[PDB]
DNA sequence: CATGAATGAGTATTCATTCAT
DNA sequence: GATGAATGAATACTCATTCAT
């Protein structure tokens, strides 16, 4: 909405990344944004609204940037390949946000996460939309359950990423694109 | 011995956390559920957290063993993998309250509970590593395959499928998804 | 600046501890006595103990400085001792609530409050050492006198007299006991 | 009374001297007495009675041992001499009790300490007896306020002793007897 | 638009005491 | 008389949210 809306959201990322979720009270977020406590409530109406809006904004930029890149290739093998690239690229490009989103937000309470889960519905559409365009043009098993095939895909990508942050980003995440991508299409078999 | 009140308390804790949440499971509430006084809890446990540790150890400390128990009743590696999915899903489908506790409510930890959960988790992860290396060494799986990467695919997929089934309050039959998930892990999307 | 609420708290705490005791002066009770919310207390203080310490410091941290400044207005060393007794008794007789809190209530502390009291107490012991050394260096007190033992006799005599006065509910003139006490510390029983 | 009555009181001294006052729960005292927690209530009314009785029993002996020793004397300042001597000798001969009395009981709530000095009036009366006897036979000056001179003597002896335990009995308490005594009779002057 | 001082609900844990056996 | 398992009352501190300037 306003110009402080972005100072706050970006502060919340940098407050949570450095201090951790349970050490990110409103006042610590405020001081990092150069803003008073009650001013937070002029731009958001909850601590929860701050956290969800953080996710919505960052997720919107995330899915939009991916769908943009897939719009070029017309062929569903590369569309998956591009997805895996872009997913890993964006997270490798911002370690701080990765920490907040893969680690500290996991330490949330339960209905903040159910809300975060609703924000993920957008990405899961892009996945499910890909999985049905791969069935009609017959790139995938033509009796594929898309609900499950989506969950295998996100589950894998999210696990591989989460383990990358717990190792403190020691290794080149994007170097794993080809092996992960090849795994999703082919499976474990020889 | 431990006496009936020990079991009473762990049972009470499981279902309280399951109806109310991790952050709404005050000790008095658990004690009322167990039919004992607040201070009686501390005659069987050190902390509230020791209740939460014992809970996870009793209810999930044989989880991996049980999977291992049935995998050993099969020769073919690809069937072992299927049994692994089947026993992973069967055990969680068999206790809805526990499924809610361990997949949702109790992942919000960062304390010693987080330590103890990772002990059990690690055990599950080596069984995956062993199954993968066996399927590897014996030509079931392609050999340029990376174990730690394939391990993250399998667990990422299963845990995702499970957590989704829990968020939709255990409606659909999780055990019916064993066969579809299995052939996805083996033969990929293509 | 500390702001008006600072010593509203410090004062109200004296009143509560003097009327209920060290063991029944809860934060909420002090808070209401000060006319502020419980949390507001922690805006001007760190702990309950920081309150007790700040209480003792303000109310008793100039106790020795004050005695000292009246002793300076005398040249006779025996007259300085009479002034010391007079000023010791004067200050406590002038604040019955602070006397109850200091002689009976804050004694039973075991923590850092005790460290800060021993600081204030030690300075007083120094003043007694200092005086006693002047006395025997100039022939007022007998040459073979032990300072630490004499410091112990004086303090113990004053402390006992003050304490019994506080326990008989402060209802007899304390300062009227200066002359006989002073005469006893000088001439003994004979 | 009973046989366990004495085991309990002695265990109370042992626990309090070893763990301090704030770590002397009834269970610890029962365990040192070789009895059950509930057995203590077959001999005392409560934990406060255990403490009061402990003082009564130790005080009663302490006063009699002094009283009978003075009965074997003629001169009154010779009686004051054995008082200071026997007072210091009984405390010097039982260190762990002297920690309980001079240290740890001072850390108790006030309205138990006010029960402690009702016990003490027996001893104080003994002093009042000595002081008035000394007045008649002309041993002391005779507008001596016995009520006040009582508070000097006890106040001194107690402070001298309390400092001895504050320093782990690093020095011989009994070598102080006549330096202390001389002070009581002769005061500070040459 | 912005401030930041005030608010006040919420909770794990200890321990003296009881009573069924 | 002895037991000891069970009881339950009692209390400091945090932090998201407001509202008076």
JSON list of C-alpha atoms (C1' of nucleotides) in Angstrom, two decimals, chain A residues 25-26 38 41 46-47, chain F residues 14-19:
[
{"chain": "A", "resi": 25, "resn": "UNK", "atom": "CA", "xyz": [8.67, -9.11, 18.53]},
{"chain": "A", "resi": 26, "resn": "UNK", "atom": "CA", "xyz": [6.93, -6.14, 16.89]},
{"chain": "A", "resi": 38, "resn": "UNK", "atom": "CA", "xyz": [2.05, 1.63, 16.58]},
{"chain": "A", "resi": 41, "resn": "UNK", "atom": "CA", "xyz": [-0.71, -1.03, 12.85]},
{"chain": "A", "resi": 46, "resn": "UNK", "atom": "CA", "xyz": [-1.78, -7.75, 12.91]},
{"chain": "A", "resi": 47, "resn": "UNK", "atom": "CA", "xyz": [1.58, -9.31, 13.64]},
{"chain": "F", "resi": 14, "resn": "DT", "atom": "C1'", "xyz": [6.43, -10.93, 28.25]},
{"chain": "F", "resi": 15, "resn": "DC", "atom": "C1'", "xyz": [4.75, -8.70, 24.35]},
{"chain": "F", "resi": 16, "resn": "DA", "atom": "C1'", "xyz": [1.00, -7.74, 20.99]},
{"chain": "F", "resi": 17, "resn": "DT", "atom": "C1'", "xyz": [-2.06, -4.03, 20.87]},
{"chain": "F", "resi": 18, "resn": "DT", "atom": "C1'", "xyz": [-3.99, 0.65, 21.86]},
{"chain": "F", "resi": 19, "resn": "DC", "atom": "C1'", "xyz": [-4.78, 5.79, 21.86]}
]
